[PDB]
């Protein structure tokens, strides 16, 4: 329920999230009096980030219940690092494959980059 300014880096990585793994996409986001960063939709992204109430696992609280995904393995990892509500944070989540990622995140504005 704590409120503070945020300055974050979000990334999507091809694989388990190993050091040599390819960074498919990344973007920056800053929320204070203004919503800015390299994020294509900062206003929407900052609002979506604040909805988690500090728990970034809540970026996965609303999955696509109808999207039927294959049960194969082609791992994809999402990350979030920086300042979240005035406190330094580090979070990552690896999905079985890209479908599983699409379905779980369900077009959350934070990862809409």
């Amino acid at each position: 329920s704590a409120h503070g300014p945020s300055a974050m880096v979000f990334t999507v990585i091809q694989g388990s999230g190993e050091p040599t793994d390819t960074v498919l996409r990344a973007t920056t986001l800053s929320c204070a009096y203004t919503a800015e960063g390299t994020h294509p939709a900062p206003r929407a992204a900052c609002d979506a980030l604040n909805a988690t109430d500090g728990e970034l696992n809540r970026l996965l609280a609303a999955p696509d219940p109808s999207l039927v995904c294959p049960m194969y393995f082609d791992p994809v990892t999402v990350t979030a690092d920086g300042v979240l509500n005035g406190r330094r944070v580090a979070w990552k989540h690896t999905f079985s494959n890209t479908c599983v990622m699409s379905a779980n995140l369900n077009s959350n504005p934070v990862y809409a980059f």
């Binding site: 409120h3 009096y33 203004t34 919503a35 206003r43 900052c46």
Partner: protein
């Protein structure tokens, strides 16, 4: 009468004495369940200086914490809207960046041209709900 009176310390923000008073006047005349009062052993405080991040608030959302007001940002954006907006966070309101100028909690979202310092109907209702039982 208010269910709660929240004390604020403006002494550490000498350059924003007027906008801090303006914010307290705007909120006191907008909500009934909570009132703001200037004082010493304050629940929350106002600070000023330079921060690359601009103005912000570090709060629990229920009267405790602090508000930082940046010099450069308050020269580009309306100081009273900035101060009233940040005071809204200490009263428990979140930001709604996608909101219009009529929404005080949209902050800097609608841009620097936006000068409205007053909370809308929904905002006034939300703060009354949050301070209803103290």
């Amino acid at each position: 009468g208010p269910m709660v009176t929240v004390t604020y310390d403006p002494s550490n923000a000498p350059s924003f004495q007027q906008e801090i008073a303006n914010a307290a006047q705007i909120w006191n005349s907008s909500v009934r369940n909570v009132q703001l009062r200037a004082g010493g052993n304050a629940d929350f405080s106002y600070y000023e200086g330079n921060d690359s991040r601009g103005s912000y608030a570090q709060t629990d959302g229920h009267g405790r914490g602090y508000i930082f007001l940046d010099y450069q940002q308050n020269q580009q954006y309306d100081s009273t809207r900035v101060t009233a907006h940040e005071t809204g966070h200490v009263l428990g309101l979140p930001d709604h960046y996608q909101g219009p100028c009529s929404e005080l909690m949209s902050g800097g979202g609608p841009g620097p041209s936006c000068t409205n310092p007053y909370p809308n109907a929904q905002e006034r209702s939300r703060v009354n709900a949050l301070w209803a039982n103290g």
